[PDB]
Amino acid sequence: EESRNTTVLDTTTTLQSSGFGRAFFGEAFNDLKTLMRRYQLYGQLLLSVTTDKDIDHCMFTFPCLPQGLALDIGSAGSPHEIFNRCRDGIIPLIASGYRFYRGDLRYKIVFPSNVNSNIWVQHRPDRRLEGWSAAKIVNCDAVSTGQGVYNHGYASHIQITRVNNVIELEVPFYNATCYNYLQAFNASSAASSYAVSLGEISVGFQATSDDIASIVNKPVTIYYSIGDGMQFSQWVGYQPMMILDQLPAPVV
Amino acid sequence: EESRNTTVLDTTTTLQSSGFGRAFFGEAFNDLKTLMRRYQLYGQLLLSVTTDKDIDHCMFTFPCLPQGLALDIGSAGSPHEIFNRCRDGIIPLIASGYRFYRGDLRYKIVFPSNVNSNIWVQHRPDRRLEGWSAAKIVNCDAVSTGQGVYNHGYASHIQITRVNNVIELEVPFYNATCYNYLQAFNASSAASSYAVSLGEISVGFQATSDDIASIVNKPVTIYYSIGDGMQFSQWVGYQPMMILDQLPAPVV
Amino acid sequence: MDNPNPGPDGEGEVELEKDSNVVLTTQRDPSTSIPAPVSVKWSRWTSNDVVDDYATITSRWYQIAEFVWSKDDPFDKELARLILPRALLSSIEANSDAICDVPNTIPFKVHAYWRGDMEVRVQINSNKFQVGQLQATWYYSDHENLNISSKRSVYGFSQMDHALISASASNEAKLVIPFKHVYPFLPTRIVPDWTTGILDMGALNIRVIAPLRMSATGPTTCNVVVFIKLNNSEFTGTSSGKFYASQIRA
Amino acid sequence: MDNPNPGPDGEGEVELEKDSNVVLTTQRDPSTSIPAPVSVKWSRWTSNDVVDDYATITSRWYQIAEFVWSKDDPFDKELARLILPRALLSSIEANSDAICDVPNTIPFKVHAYWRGDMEVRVQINSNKFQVGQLQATWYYSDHENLNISSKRSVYGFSQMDHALISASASNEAKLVIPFKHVYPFLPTRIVPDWTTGILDMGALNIRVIAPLRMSATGPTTCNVVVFIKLNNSEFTGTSSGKFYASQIRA
Amino acid sequence: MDNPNPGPDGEGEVELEKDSNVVLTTQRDPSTSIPAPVSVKWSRWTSNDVVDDYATITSRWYQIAEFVWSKDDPFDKELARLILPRALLSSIEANSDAICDVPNTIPFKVHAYWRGDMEVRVQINSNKFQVGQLQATWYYSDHENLNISSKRSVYGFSQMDHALISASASNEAKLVIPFKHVYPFLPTRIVPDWTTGILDMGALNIRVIAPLRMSATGPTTCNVVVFIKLNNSEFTGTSSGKFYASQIRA
Amino acid sequence: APVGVVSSMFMQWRGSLEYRFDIIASQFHTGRLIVGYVPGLTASLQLQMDYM
């Protein structure tokens, strides 16, 4: 069996327990769940207006899942240095260790400062993730479906950038499932696709196109953490790691 | 292990215990220590004056140990028939079986009858035995050290041959040791040499040289037994024996 | 202890494991490994229609895979990535006869939906002088995880709990496999919201941790056989068997 | 009883013997043989100067000899007449490094005098199909006894208590060796009254009682290794280590 | 349990079976088979003349047959149809010396009539790697039954109770054989109403149920030896030994 | 090892590790092996090691 221990050959005299730093630093690091709630960078983008957007059009939409977005190094010419360098993170690294999850997420999107415009944020529980490809932030183009616009029923919230430019969130667990998939997802069942993302958040500015020019190529970093109610389930061993200090130097 | 007995295959119905002859002859032979105290021939000699001895000179000196003197068959022309024939004895044969001893000895030297002269007997705890060679009776020559003469401090006794010609002794245990060596001795440590003999007894006549001529080539047999306080220690298996009835005949 | 007395009977005790009308024996202690705590019944939340476990036939032991394991197989070498609810059906159909023929699997021919704990024994008969070691590892909904192709290696299954099958001891590997899946019930045929990946809880897989090693003139092969009980199951949604389609060939 | 069930773990229990920070195992029961009753401490009678056993380092197990035992060795054939307090030092120095390097033996580098019980295990790894039998026999102050050259044979050590090491069972031979010597303490260097025969209590010796026997194509060699605990010891007479001389080469 | 620790002693316990002055051992548990309930003494009904069992010599174990059992022997192949009271005498005389010489059998030289339970052990020393199986079967007054020549086959003795001697386990077969015969006493010499078929209770016979099987270079032969206690006996009718005739040669 | 991933997230660690050794052999194999531990070996001293 895996955790069996046939015949211990103890040499150690007993070492003092430290309580995971409780005896030194004053804080236990035993529960890995409480570390999971330190916020992590989730995605990152430079806003890119394409079509002449109206008040209603979403500026970008991303699926919201604990697994972490499929990692986006960026194009070879313009890397997002943190994901290029600081690969993945903590929460996805532990999400690597389990096979199912059932819980909330929190986000705290940090909008660009220079813009003044109001910002709405839909949550869309309906949407199915459609394979691990296109599990990434998407800059929506011309409206053609209801995907591109504000919608009435979906839960939403509207930060006033002028007052404070970081809307904070609580994406809830709405799925008709026991508990969702947690590793990378290739979609076998067609109904397996409802079994991953908590929803499909959509951020959108209310700016008219005359003012939208200020917004172009302004950064919008995003954060996430597992939201207290989260509970990963089945243990599954780690897929091979790739040591970071061993990554190649830029070379002068 | 040596004394282990894995699976006895008893066939015997129980035999009556005899108590080692207690039930017949009226005396137990169980304890081998009490047999050790029957006296044994220890050495033997024909006195041989060389130098013109004074009153004080020792006539002969021998180390006194339980192991028995190194066996002296005598020269090929003039064998001492008992050691030649009746090899060793009992006490040395059992001294063969143990590795350490710690105890007294008794001697009862039997001087020649024809001589009248007084006889003194030193005990000399000081002396180291010097290897198994020269662990034998020695006919001392000209005085050169204090070895050849009567000494003041050493314990001594003086038989009057005219009254009874067999001084009886009790050589005591004087060594700065836990307990002495008991097999044959080759002297490894220089301080190992104090670890064998109880002492180094010296017999000497008080005759002037004019009277010493009567004494020449008169036998002086010696006896010994382990003296009650003796206690051999560590068990050690017997070295190969040599059966006596198988010794060669004189051949007519 | 330490007192052998073999007779005509042979030496050791023989522990059993009767179920319905199938008894099967292992001389050795099973190396049990249980991935999850036993499942709650869950017919309550998703089935008005008549529900019934068929304990007298579904719970019988029935073979699903068997395979030679020769010394030629290199260290990390899959012997069998069995799916489980499917292999119980896929093997039968692979053996050129319909699901209806086999008593264990008739309720699948009818009922639209299945749930329930599984049992899997991976019995072996290596000779005592052979040296080697299988691992048997259950991995829930493997197919859903696209990067699994990299994980699927003995270093990667040894971290999750897994049975070990030493070829020296010819040890038999028990493996309780309680139901866990994103959806409480597994469909047994094409169903309105999904089609592909039918009746696929996940996959047992038997990677080698140590290849057989033997004297050059010793016994090369080492056969293995894998029985599967389907115990605390329950079926729901009665439906005609003509809707049923033969399981994907695998 | 009589119910083998080998697993990945293998079959039998593994008894241990931890000391300081050295644990070592034997699958088999040791064939203990104890020549003498345990020694009294005796620092009382011959040492004003500070005395101290170093239980935390002197009592550790440490190897002193190892040797192949091939079938070529004839019936009565010594494999190793180890001296014991010396071999613990003589082997280290023979291995081309000073006594100071090894934790067990540093106090010998300093203290002028040693006393104390020894422990000696003569572990072996003969294969189960081999047939043979070592004896291990401790003989106090052997060198002092000049006729020992005749005694030193298996007929002659089997009379005193001695360990037996069957090669069939691959049995391990424990051997308690309590201090007994004519002088209560053994010096660790040249000392005013003796020089030669330094630190020489006596000798372990491992005569063969039955040569290995095997099929012509079977395993010829049978290695043996001999650990030595130095437990209830005590050292006395602190002294500079520059006085210490390398042990006689043996 | 399951904790082997072989020593110089070897591993298992050795059960014994002392009688008079003969002890003999079997490492394995005997496969006892007892054809009949123990006999009543019956000297009461047919002997005024002095009667006396000789427990101190008649009850001793003594060999009566021994035989090689090579792999060449085909499935159903008799190894030895021993008669029993006769073989105890017939073997001795076959070994070229008179009955009077052997302590077990002297009372037969004198007393006209015998009765009493027998014991028969069929010890074997097959190697552990051999595969085969003797049966040992006692058949009362076989010679009286003329069709026995057809019955005398392993299918036919396996129906009556019989010992089994696996060659794998080298099992030893105990076999109590209480007296039963049409006449309460067996004569030891020609007697007024019968002559032929003297002292013939019936016959032990050791048919093979499975021929030895082994690797081509393995140990071919497998020797067997058969001891016979003659315990709860009683003799009656004292008579001169000159009347005694040597047993039929068989 | 799972300990080798869960401990990469943290700057500091302490306490005992446990190396199980499955020596895969038939019971008829026999042998013996040291499994030592040397405190304080800098990489230059990583060599010069031998079981003694």
Side-chain angles (χ1 to χ4, degrees):
Chain A
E1 200 281 341
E2 177 274 330
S3 179
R4 69 175 179 84
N5 189 337
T6 299
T7 302
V8 178
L9 296 178
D10 183 67
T11 292
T12 64
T13 58
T14 301
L15 181 66
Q16 182 67 260
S17 178
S18 179
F20 288 88
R22 176 75 70 179
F24 289 101
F25 315 111
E27 55 185 339
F29 297 100
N30 188 30
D31 52 349
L32 186 62
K33 183 173 176 288
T34 197
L35 182 145
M36 206 75 67
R37 282 172 289 183
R38 174 176 291 180
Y39 279 91
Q40 176 178 348
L41 182 63
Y42 177 76
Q44 188 174 356
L45 56 79
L46 298 175
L47 294 170
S48 64
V49 175
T50 301
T51 58
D52 52 352
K53 293 184 180 300
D54 184 65
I55 310 307
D56 296 342
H57 303 169
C58 58
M59 183 68 75
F60 64 89
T61 65
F62 57 91
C64 54
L65 49 80
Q67 312 167 338
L69 296 174
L71 183 139
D72 187 4
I73 304 102
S75 64
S78 178
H80 299 165
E81 282 298 323
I82 179 171
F83 300 101
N84 192 344
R85 191 70 62 182
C86 302
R87 188 74 68 184
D88 283 331
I90 292 175
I91 298 169
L93 177 62
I94 300 168
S96 178
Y98 296 95
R99 181 52 180 157
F100 301 107
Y101 76 93
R102 181 177 176 82
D104 299 344
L105 290 179
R106 301 174 186 169
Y107 276 88
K108 192 183 300 297
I109 296 104
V110 180
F111 300 107
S113 65
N114 291 284
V115 63
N116 287 278
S117 64
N118 304 284
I119 299 168
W120 53 269
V121 175
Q122 290 294 323
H123 183 201
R124 294 195 182 91
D126 292 342
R127 307 290 179 267
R128 56 164 63 92
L129 186 147
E130 294 177 350
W132 189 244
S133 177
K136 61 189 180 69
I137 295 171
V138 176
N139 297 132
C140 291
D141 290 344
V143 178
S144 62
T145 58
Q147 178 64 261
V149 298
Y150 194 88
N151 299 285
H152 296 293
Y154 293 136
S156 64
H157 187 280
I158 294 168
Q159 183 61 264
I160 291 92
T161 300
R162 185 170 187 167
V163 176
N164 184 29
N165 60 33
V166 55
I167 184 171
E168 302 173 355
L169 292 177
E170 174 65 8
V171 175
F173 185 86
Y174 295 146
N175 290 135
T177 60
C178 295
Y179 30 75
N180 292 290
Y181 289 134
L182 183 64
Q183 300 297 322
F185 177 76
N186 68 345
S188 179
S189 295
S192 175
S193 60
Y194 289 89
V196 179
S197 65
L198 294 175
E200 192 266 336
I201 290 175
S202 66
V203 178
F205 297 86
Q206 290 186 340
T208 56
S209 65
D210 59 355
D211 183 69
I212 203 69
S214 296
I215 296 173
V216 176
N217 293 130
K218 301 299 182 182
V220 180
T221 59
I222 296 171
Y223 292 127
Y224 86 108
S225 66
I226 57 103
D228 176 68
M230 183 66 75
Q231 290 294 322
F232 308 104
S233 292
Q234 187 66 55
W235 178 254
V236 163
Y238 296 124
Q239 294 174 334
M241 296 291 105
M242 55 174 280
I243 302 170
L244 292 180
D245 62 9
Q246 191 170 353
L247 293 178
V251 173
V252 175
Chain B
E1 200 281 341
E2 177 274 330
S3 179
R4 69 175 179 84
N5 189 337
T6 299
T7 302
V8 178
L9 296 178
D10 183 67
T11 292
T12 64
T13 58
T14 301
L15 181 66
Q16 182 67 260
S17 178
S18 179
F20 288 88
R22 176 75 70 179
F24 289 101
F25 315 111
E27 55 185 339
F29 297 100
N30 188 30
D31 52 349
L32 186 62
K33 183 173 176 288
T34 197
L35 183 145
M36 206 75 67
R37 282 172 289 183
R38 174 176 291 180
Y39 279 91
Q40 176 178 348
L41 182 63
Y42 177 76
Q44 188 174 356
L45 56 79
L46 298 175
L47 294 170
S48 64
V49 175
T50 301
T51 58
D52 52 352
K53 293 184 180 300
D54 184 65
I55 310 307
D56 296 342
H57 303 169
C58 58
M59 183 68 75
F60 64 89
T61 65
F62 57 91
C64 54
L65 49 80
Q67 312 167 338
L69 296 174
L71 183 139
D72 187 4
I73 304 102
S75 64
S78 178
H80 299 165
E81 282 298 323
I82 179 171
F83 300 101
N84 192 344
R85 191 70 62 182
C86 302
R87 188 74 68 184
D88 283 331
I90 292 175
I91 298 169
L93 177 62
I94 300 168
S96 178
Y98 296 95
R99 181 52 180 157
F100 301 107
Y101 76 93
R102 181 177 176 82
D104 299 344
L105 290 179
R106 301 174 186 169
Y107 276 88
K108 192 183 300 297
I109 296 104
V110 180
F111 300 107
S113 65
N114 291 284
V115 63
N116 287 278
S117 64
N118 304 284
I119 299 168
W120 53 269
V121 175
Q122 290 294 323
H123 183 201
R124 294 195 182 91
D126 292 342
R127 307 290 179 267
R128 56 164 63 92
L129 186 147
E130 294 177 350
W132 189 244
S133 177
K136 61 189 180 69
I137 295 171
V138 176
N139 297 132
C140 291
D141 290 344
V143 178
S144 62
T145 58
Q147 178 65 261
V149 298
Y150 194 88
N151 299 285
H152 296 293
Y154 293 136
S156 64
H157 187 280
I158 294 168
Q159 183 61 264
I160 291 92
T161 300
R162 185 170 187 167
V163 176
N164 184 29
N165 60 33
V166 55
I167 184 171
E168 302 173 355
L169 292 177
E170 174 65 8
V171 175
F173 185 86
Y174 295 146
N175 290 135
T177 60
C178 295
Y179 30 75
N180 292 290
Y181 289 134
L182 183 64
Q183 300 297 322
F185 177 76
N186 68 345
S188 179
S189 295
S192 175
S193 60
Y194 289 89
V196 179
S197 65
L198 294 175
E200 192 266 336
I201 290 175
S202 66
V203 178
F205 297 86
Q206 290 186 340
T208 56
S209 65
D210 59 355
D211 183 69
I212 203 69
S214 296
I215 296 173
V216 176
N217 293 130
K218 301 299 182 182
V220 180
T221 59
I222 296 171
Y223 292 127
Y224 86 108
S225 66
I226 57 103
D228 176 68
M230 183 66 75
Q231 290 294 322
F232 308 104
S233 292
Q234 187 66 55
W235 178 254
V236 163
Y238 296 124
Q239 294 174 334
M241 296 291 105
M242 55 174 280
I243 302 170
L244 292 180
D245 62 9
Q246 191 170 353
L247 293 178
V251 173
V252 175
Chain C
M1 294 300 293
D2 290 345
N3 186 340
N5 53 31
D9 293 341
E11 184 176 2
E13 185 67 14
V14 179
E15 59 185 341
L16 309 183
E17 189 174 3
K18 181 183 171 63
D19 285 340
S20 294
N21 63 346
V22 174
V23 177
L24 57 79
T25 64
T26 60
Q27 305 297 99
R28 307 287 185 264
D29 288 343
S31 64
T32 62
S33 63
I34 300 169
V38 177
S39 64
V40 181
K41 199 70 174 294
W42 270 89
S43 177
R44 291 193 297 274
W45 293 98
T46 172
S47 179
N48 290 131
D49 193 2
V50 175
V51 175
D52 184 65
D53 56 351
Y54 299 92
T56 59
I57 56 173
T58 58
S59 66
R60 299 176 63 253
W61 298 98
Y62 186 83
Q63 185 176 357
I64 55 174
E66 59 184 342
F67 49 87
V68 178
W69 167 57
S70 66
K71 66 179 181 181
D72 288 343
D73 290 346
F75 165 67
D76 184 66
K77 171 62 161 59
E78 66 183 344
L79 295 177
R81 294 183 297 103
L82 296 174
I83 298 169
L84 285 181
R86 283 161 61 89
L88 175 60
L89 301 176
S90 176
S91 67
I92 296 173
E93 291 178 350
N95 198 340
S96 178
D97 55 354
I99 301 300
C100 54
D101 295 342
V102 177
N104 295 281
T105 61
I106 52 173
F108 291 96
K109 179 67 171 173
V110 172
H111 296 74
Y113 295 135
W114 173 79
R115 193 176 201 269
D117 297 345
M118 296 184 287
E119 296 289 320
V120 171
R121 297 176 72 88
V122 184
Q123 299 183 339
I124 187 170
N125 281 286
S126 63
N127 192 340
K128 187 178 291 180
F129 295 90
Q130 293 172 337
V131 173
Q133 182 168 350
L134 273 57
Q135 66 176 17
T137 306
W138 170 251
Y139 183 78
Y140 287 90
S141 62
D142 65 348
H143 188 279
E144 307 300 324
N145 183 29
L146 62 79
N147 288 130
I148 186 173
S149 296
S150 63
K151 180 176 173 60
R152 184 178 292 172
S153 179
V154 292
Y155 293 95
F157 290 105
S158 66
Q159 299 176 339
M160 72 187 85
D161 54 355
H162 65 290
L164 293 174
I165 301 170
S166 62
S168 174
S170 176
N171 187 337
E172 173 272 335
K174 186 179 174 62
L175 182 65
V176 179
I177 298 168
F179 183 89
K180 284 175 63 180
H181 188 202
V182 179
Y183 298 98
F185 281 82
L186 291 172
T188 60
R189 57 183 172 84
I190 291 172
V191 165
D193 198 5
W194 81 65
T195 63
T196 303
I198 188 60
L199 188 60
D200 177 71
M201 186 190 289
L204 171 61
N205 50 35
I206 301 168
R207 311 283 288 177
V208 179
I209 291 175
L212 282 175
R213 296 179 183 277
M214 61 191 81
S215 65
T217 58
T220 300
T221 59
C222 176
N223 289 273
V224 175
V225 172
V226 178
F227 301 96
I228 181 170
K229 184 179 181 180
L230 191 67
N231 60 347
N232 195 31
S233 66
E234 73 181 349
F235 300 88
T236 188
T238 300
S239 176
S240 179
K242 293 185 71 66
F243 300 115
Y244 183 80
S246 178
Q247 292 301 323
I248 297 170
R249 181 63 177 166
Chain D
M1 294 300 293
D2 290 345
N3 186 340
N5 53 31
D9 293 341
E11 184 176 2
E13 185 67 14
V14 179
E15 59 185 341
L16 309 183
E17 189 174 3
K18 181 183 171 63
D19 285 340
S20 294
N21 63 346
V22 174
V23 177
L24 57 79
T25 64
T26 60
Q27 305 297 99
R28 307 287 185 264
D29 288 343
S31 64
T32 62
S33 63
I34 300 169
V38 177
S39 64
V40 181
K41 199 70 174 294
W42 270 89
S43 177
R44 291 193 297 274
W45 293 97
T46 172
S47 179
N48 290 131
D49 193 2
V50 175
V51 175
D52 184 65
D53 56 351
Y54 299 92
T56 59
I57 56 173
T58 58
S59 66
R60 299 176 63 253
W61 298 98
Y62 186 83
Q63 185 176 357
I64 55 174
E66 59 184 342
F67 49 87
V68 178
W69 167 57
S70 66
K71 66 179 181 181
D72 288 343
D73 290 346
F75 165 67
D76 184 66
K77 171 62 161 59
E78 66 183 344
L79 295 177
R81 294 183 297 103
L82 296 174
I83 298 169
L84 285 181
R86 283 161 61 89
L88 175 60
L89 301 176
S90 176
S91 67
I92 296 173
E93 292 178 350
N95 198 340
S96 178
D97 55 354
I99 300 300
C100 54
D101 295 342
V102 177
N104 295 281
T105 61
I106 52 173
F108 291 96
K109 179 67 171 173
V110 172
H111 296 74
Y113 295 135
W114 173 79
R115 193 176 201 269
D117 297 345
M118 296 184 287
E119 296 289 320
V120 171
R121 297 176 72 88
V122 184
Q123 299 183 339
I124 187 170
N125 281 286
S126 63
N127 192 340
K128 187 178 291 180
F129 295 90
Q130 293 172 337
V131 173
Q133 182 168 350
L134 273 57
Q135 66 176 17
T137 306
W138 170 251
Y139 183 78
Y140 287 90
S141 62
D142 65 348
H143 188 278
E144 307 300 324
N145 183 29
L146 62 79
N147 288 130
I148 186 173
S149 296
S150 63
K151 180 176 173 60
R152 184 178 292 172
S153 179
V154 292
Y155 293 95
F157 290 105
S158 66
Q159 300 176 339
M160 72 187 85
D161 54 355
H162 65 290
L164 293 174
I165 301 170
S166 62
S168 174
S170 176
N171 187 337
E172 173 272 335
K174 186 179 174 62
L175 182 65
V176 179
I177 298 168
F179 183 89
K180 284 175 63 180
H181 188 202
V182 179
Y183 298 98
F185 281 82
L186 291 172
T188 60
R189 57 183 172 84
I190 291 172
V191 165
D193 198 5
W194 81 65
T195 63
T196 303
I198 188 60
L199 188 60
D200 177 71
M201 186 190 289
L204 171 61
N205 50 35
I206 301 168
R207 311 283 288 177
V208 179
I209 291 175
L212 282 175
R213 296 179 183 277
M214 61 191 81
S215 65
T217 58
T220 300
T221 59
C222 176
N223 289 274
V224 175
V225 172
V226 178
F227 301 96
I228 181 170
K229 184 179 181 180
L230 191 67
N231 60 347
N232 195 31
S233 66
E234 73 181 349
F235 300 88
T236 188
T238 300
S239 176
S240 179
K242 293 185 71 66
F243 300 115
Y244 183 80
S246 178
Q247 292 301 323
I248 297 170
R249 181 63 177 166
Chain E
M1 294 300 293
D2 290 345
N3 186 340
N5 53 31
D9 293 341
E11 184 176 2
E13 185 67 14
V14 179
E15 59 185 341
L16 309 183
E17 189 174 3
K18 181 183 171 63
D19 285 340
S20 294
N21 63 346
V22 174
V23 177
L24 57 79
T25 64
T26 60
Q27 305 297 99
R28 307 287 185 264
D29 288 343
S31 64
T32 62
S33 63
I34 300 169
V38 177
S39 64
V40 181
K41 199 70 174 294
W42 270 89
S43 177
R44 291 193 297 274
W45 293 97
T46 172
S47 179
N48 290 131
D49 193 2
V50 175
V51 175
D52 184 65
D53 56 351
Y54 299 92
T56 59
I57 56 173
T58 58
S59 66
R60 299 176 63 253
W61 298 98
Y62 186 83
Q63 185 176 357
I64 55 174
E66 59 184 342
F67 49 87
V68 178
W69 167 57
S70 66
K71 66 179 181 181
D72 288 343
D73 290 346
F75 165 67
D76 184 66
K77 171 62 161 59
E78 66 183 344
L79 295 177
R81 294 183 297 103
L82 296 174
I83 298 169
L84 285 181
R86 283 161 61 89
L88 175 60
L89 301 176
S90 176
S91 67
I92 296 173
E93 292 178 350
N95 198 340
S96 178
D97 55 354
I99 300 300
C100 54
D101 295 342
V102 177
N104 295 281
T105 61
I106 52 173
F108 291 96
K109 179 67 171 173
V110 172
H111 296 74
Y113 295 135
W114 173 79
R115 193 176 201 269
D117 297 345
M118 296 184 287
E119 296 289 320
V120 171
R121 297 176 72 88
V122 184
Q123 299 183 339
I124 187 170
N125 281 286
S126 63
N127 192 340
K128 187 178 291 180
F129 295 90
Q130 293 172 337
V131 173
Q133 182 168 350
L134 273 57
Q135 66 176 17
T137 306
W138 170 251
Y139 183 78
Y140 287 90
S141 62
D142 65 348
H143 188 278
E144 307 300 324
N145 183 29
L146 62 79
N147 288 130
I148 186 173
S149 296
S150 63
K151 180 176 173 60
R152 184 178 292 172
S153 179
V154 292
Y155 293 95
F157 290 105
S158 66
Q159 300 176 339
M160 72 187 85
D161 54 355
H162 65 290
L164 293 174
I165 301 170
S166 62
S168 174
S170 176
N171 187 337
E172 173 272 335
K174 186 179 174 62
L175 182 65
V176 179
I177 298 168
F179 183 89
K180 284 175 63 180
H181 188 202
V182 179
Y183 298 98
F185 281 82
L186 291 172
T188 60
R189 57 183 172 84
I190 291 172
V191 165
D193 198 5
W194 81 65
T195 63
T196 303
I198 188 60
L199 188 60
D200 177 71
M201 186 190 289
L204 171 61
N205 50 35
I206 301 168
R207 311 283 288 177
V208 179
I209 291 175
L212 282 175
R213 296 179 183 277
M214 61 191 81
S215 65
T217 58
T220 300
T221 59
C222 176
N223 289 273
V224 175
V225 172
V226 178
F227 301 96
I228 181 170
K229 184 179 181 180
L230 191 67
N231 60 347
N232 195 31
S233 66
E234 73 181 349
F235 300 88
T236 188
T238 300
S239 176
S240 179
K242 293 185 71 66
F243 300 115
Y244 183 80
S246 178
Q247 292 301 323
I248 297 170
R249 181 63 177 166
Chain F
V3 66
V5 173
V6 70
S7 175
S8 66
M9 297 185 286
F10 297 96
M11 175 177 71
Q12 298 178 337
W13 64 270
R14 66 185 297 275
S16 299
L17 290 177
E18 290 184 352
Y19 298 135
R20 184 180 67 195
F21 295 90
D22 280 343
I23 301 169
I24 297 169
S26 63
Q27 62 183 19
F28 299 98
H29 291 85
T30 53
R32 174 173 292 116
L33 52 82
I34 297 175
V35 183
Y37 174 81
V38 184
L41 285 180
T42 187
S44 65
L45 296 173
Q46 192 72 260
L47 58 84
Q48 295 179 337
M49 288 297 295
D50 55 352
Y51 68 98
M52 191 60 68

